Amino acid sequence: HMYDVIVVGAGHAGCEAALAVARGGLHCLLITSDLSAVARMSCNPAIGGVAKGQITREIDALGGEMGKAIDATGIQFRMLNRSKGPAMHSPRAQADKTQYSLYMRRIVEHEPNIDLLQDTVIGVSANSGKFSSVTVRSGRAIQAKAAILACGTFLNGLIHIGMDHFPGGRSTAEPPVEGLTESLASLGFSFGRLKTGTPPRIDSRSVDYTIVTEQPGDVDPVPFSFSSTSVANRNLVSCYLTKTTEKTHDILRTGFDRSPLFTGCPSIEDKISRFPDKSSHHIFLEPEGTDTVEMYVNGFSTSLPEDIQIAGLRSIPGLEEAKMIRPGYAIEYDFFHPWQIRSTMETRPVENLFFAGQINGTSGYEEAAAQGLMAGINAVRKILGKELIVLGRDQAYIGVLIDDLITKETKEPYRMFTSSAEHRLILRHDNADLRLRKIGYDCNLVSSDDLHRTESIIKRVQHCLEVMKTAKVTPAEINTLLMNKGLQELKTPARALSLIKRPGISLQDILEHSLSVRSAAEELCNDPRVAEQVQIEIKYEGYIKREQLVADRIARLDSLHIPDNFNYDSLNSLSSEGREKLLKHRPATIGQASRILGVSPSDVSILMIRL
Amino acid sequence: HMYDVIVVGAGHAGCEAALAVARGGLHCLLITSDLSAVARMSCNPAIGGVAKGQITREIDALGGEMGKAIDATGIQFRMLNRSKGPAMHSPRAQADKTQYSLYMRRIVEHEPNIDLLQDTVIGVSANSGKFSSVTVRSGRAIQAKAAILACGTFLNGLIHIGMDHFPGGRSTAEPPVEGLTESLASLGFSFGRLKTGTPPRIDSRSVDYTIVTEQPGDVDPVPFSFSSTSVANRNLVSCYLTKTTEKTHDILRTGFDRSPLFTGCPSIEDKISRFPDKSSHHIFLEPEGTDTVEMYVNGFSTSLPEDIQIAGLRSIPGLEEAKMIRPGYAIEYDFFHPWQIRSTMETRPVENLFFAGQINGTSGYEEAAAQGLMAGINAVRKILGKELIVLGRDQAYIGVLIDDLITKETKEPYRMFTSSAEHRLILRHDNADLRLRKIGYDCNLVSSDDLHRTESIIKRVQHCLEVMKTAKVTPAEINTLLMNKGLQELKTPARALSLIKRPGISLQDILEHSLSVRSAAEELCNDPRVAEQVQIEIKYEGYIKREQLVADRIARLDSLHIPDNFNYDSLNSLSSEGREKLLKHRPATIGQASRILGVSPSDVSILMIRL
Ligand SMILES: Cc1cc2nc3c(=O)[nH]c(=O)nc-3n(C[C@H](O)[C@H](O)[C@H](O)COP(=O)(O)OP(=O)(O)OC[C@H]3O[C@@H](n4cnc5c(N)ncnc54)[C@H](O)[C@@H]3O)c2cc1C
């Protein structure tokens, strides 16, 4: 009798993986090179942002830790894109790097099913194309039914500061892993190399708080976790805004031809290069903890020579006397081409071997965590012999991410920010639980008191929308309100509640003004979530139906997975630039085929009147 | 304008060093390879013990952090040698390893004079035999007036598990430093190599809490820091006692010839080898935190092959199903021969360069911390041009340690436990503040409210001892007490308080029983400290005078630093051996000369009728 799943690496993918395997009721072994460093935040002292916020909430909705961890460890909470719509609202908080990592370990150590081991994996062994065991530095083999690899930037890592380069997996402070990459190539795996940068850290006390403008967390912040109740008290530090000078840019041009991130997006070098017309660039100074002196210089990711970096930083207003604790650097690492893995996070070359995280050439904690979660769930499912889970592009940002990963192949690590997923309103942060909670249940990650509670919150919204049409509102109550708001004047018999609250009126502006409505529905009053959902469902009726119709169109397309071993030289009126892109790329699903820039909308129509 | 003191390495020596330099009002630069790891407790999850407790309190008394840190971070407090006397009482507490480290960083970061840098030093540059600068990995030179080196086990470190060996400075998880040792040898420094072991860590949950006997922290524990007020609430975890079997020893004999710690004291291998007559050995299972699952297996330091270790551990009762998170290993490292440094912690080969910690071939946090403190103080003094501080063997355990270090030259790292410092009662833990507090003041480390407070506590003790000869106690009050204690029966007029409290009666047993005494002195009541001091001063009158008389002979002979420039060839009635040990060792003080095992009591007498 041995282990079920052994998860290598206890970073962001590794944790969500090991936690999912354990909470899924299977014996799990977490192997990692350094326990002092579980879930360490190597780069940004923050979680969330444009696409990252949504994907974090979706991790929470499925029963993952990252959501809870940031609510537990936040330093300033700030929602991005406030003036924009529900689809644009993006949750983001600063983390206490060290306190975040401690929390994540604490959780992993309190889960009975996870045994821990501090060693480095230098090889994975496999018999006739299916996983068997894993070789640690000592040369032991450790036997398991299925293994998740979550190695981040450690596989033959190299640190680049200007022209010199040192061994190092995350920072110079970490030894790189050396055995494993050759061992995997030995099992028929192709691999490339990626570079990603981190900005320098500076001593807070060396900053001129007379010039730099302070940016506090917003009054009444938003919790990532649907289980959390408040994060009001978690507004402990604020961040600090500045911009760069034309004079900063001159200093940095010096080192361009030395920095191994300069290209032809991940640089300040690259930024000034691709945009020499903007005479300014934003930088955010972010404390890394509530009482550390270490400060992260956002938007200044760099590989310039150590001496040029300080010269640049000091030119930035507010940082004339900046003391630099670490230089910014780039990490070069081995990654495994994302076509080699399935949508299910399982690998093609070997069954029961899953890849999650930076190792798939993605970048981001949230991005890595989401993969770890799925890879974890699916490792349990495989051992049980149950159905593996793939999320749809109409279901989650995670679905879009994992699909885009295995599909879109490019020389740069995949970030979700440039990902302008046209499915926006239906995938907004605030309904993630409704969408994914049931899927969470099937994987033993969401409690019944949770699952059943989300099943009832949807019942109330639609039950309320019943009343929002019947309910009537006389021009006696709202006319004086509308006079001041300068909105639509109610000359007449407008009731049809929905027809009122659309152009710029709150749902609560009505319940407050008519006895009619609150009598028919005061349940939304008592619950603030229903109130929030209903108010959007009707204020965005038009656009939701429009988006959902396309999502179903795209759902139907992604639901024809049978195009494989058939003559691409059978189709009648195709090609001339299509057909050649089809034979080159070889699309798995016909939905995947409609995103190749070579094929036309008219070409995929002739592939449908076929399959 | 540059830096004053740059301290390399932020371990135990490094911190006390950097903190002493800063609190001493000088600009300081702490350079260390990894900030995530300041003051990390690489080995034992505890502070104090036999000699180590006293030396911690003495660090506190001088204005160091280690005392405060363990009061802040203790998990179980336990005084060792309870049944023995005041000289034997030794304070010791378990630390939350991770929480201890965090505290120590927090303090260093809140000291304005310390700037921080994360880099590795690969060289120290010097002009005409005096310190000038320090070369970091990038090849920058960083200029300073004086530099403390506190590198611990990192200088060309090598990890030994049985027969295979990996690079690594503290654990496998750390890169070793490579440039510096050759650069120092280049400046005329000899260096050797030492090996020290750490025991394996095990998962708490894999322990059989039916067999293992629990050892709670003692009711009413003792604070290390004289500034702390209680540590009562800091009894959060307890430790777990077991012993080894004859069967454990058989399993371990297998790997003896592989383990590079086996010799001919630092091993379980060595222990069973040197003592095969004892059919049992003690092991202490110590949690490393209040809520970590990681557990330290004290008394099982080992270098045996990874597979033999687990086989051994499982044979120990209570650990039949033990899951091992890490193997025990040995660390081999470069150290600099302690004769090359002065008593003042400054080096002979180069002025303004100080050596502190494991780099002087000592072992222990406290041992390292104490050196750091002194090295720090003396770096400030040198730059100011003030008197350097050397502590005497009658003043502190730190004085004994530093003297023994530069004097006693042996193939093994120096530990204070085997150090049976005959000066015991005068150096007990509980008066450390009185002895050293004034010395602390001169170095800007002890506040006036502190210094003046210790100057007044001594006033009360002697002021009380005035009254303890005068005050009277009738046989009416104590006779019933003495009847139960079965002590001396008071037939008659015994007053003379002192004459009462001697054979087995508390000072507080009297104040409680006679109206006479508390009326004449209730000040000792209010200062439970005065009460504690007085009670010993009189219960140990005989032995204190006896010890102090010998200490005064060693006092005089300490400060006979005159024989600087003369040959041992012009000295008459000396040798055989005696003259050859003198030319070899080359003693600084003639007191130091009388402790060399080669020279006789009659030989030093002919060195005195001379100087
Ligand atoms: C330019 C740039 C921009 C970025 N922007 C963002 C951003 O906007 N938002 C954001 O959240 N993040 C951002 N990051 C991303 C972040 O740096 C990485 O994505 C993250 O460090 C990788 O996560 P991971 O879980 O996949 O692996 P890691 O967290 O790096 O995990 C590696 C862990 O596995 C262990 N390990 C590795 N290999 C082995 C082995 N073989 N044997 C045993 N143990 C092993 C190690 O101990 C380590 O702890 C950015 C990074 C860059 C470079």
Ligand SMILES: Cc1cc2nc3c(=O)[nH]c(=O)nc-3n(C[C@H](O)[C@H](O)[C@H](O)COP(=O)(O)OP(=O)(O)OC[C@H]3O[C@@H](n4cnc5c(N)ncnc54)[C@H](O)[C@@H]3O)c2cc1C
């Ligand atoms: C067998 C054994 C028994 C022990 N028993 C005890 C005991 O009973 N009680 C006890 O308290 N302890 C015990 N220990 C002792 C303990 O393991 C060491 O003494 C301690 O780790 C060394 O302390 P230090 O301050 O000198 O250096 P360290 O704490 O090891 O400091 C090294 C630090 O300096 C930095 N650094 C090093 N070199 C450089 C460089 N060149 N450039 C930049 N930064 C650098 C690193 O980042 C690191 O954090 C024991 C150890 C062994 C092996």
